């Protein structure tokens, strides 16, 4: 679709490598570590999808 097809997504980075045939329905934000992140933040607290 022209600038669409948002229903198909992926994950560029995750907190840990997935196990064989492991499925993860949640999409929580990865923690930054060097700065307390609850909502939106910088270094490592971007949206994974």
């Amino acid at each position: 679709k022209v600038g669409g097809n948002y229903n198909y997504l992926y994950r560029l980075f995750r907190k840990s490598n997935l196990k064989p045939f492991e499925r993860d329905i949640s999409t929580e934000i990865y923690q930054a570590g060097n700065k307390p992140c609850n909502g939106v933040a910088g270094f490592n607290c971007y949206f994974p999808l």
Binding site: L12, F13, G42, F43, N44, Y46
Partner: protein, 49 residues
């Protein structure tokens, strides 16, 4: 003092250990966008230049 956009200042970096963390000593920048790589695992690889 930074240079103009057409005369963009280019600097070559080689033969030195690059600490990708000192890049986050200040933090209001809105566009920390990395293409092709992840901003977290930058310390897990090495490049020639």
């Amino acid at each position: 003092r930074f240079a103009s956009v057409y005369a963009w200042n280019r600097k070559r970096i080689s033969n030195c250990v690059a600490d990708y963390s000192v890049l986050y000593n200040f933090a209001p920048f809105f566009a920390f966008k990395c293409y092709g790589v992840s901003p977290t695992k930058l310390n897990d690889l090495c490049f020639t230049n």
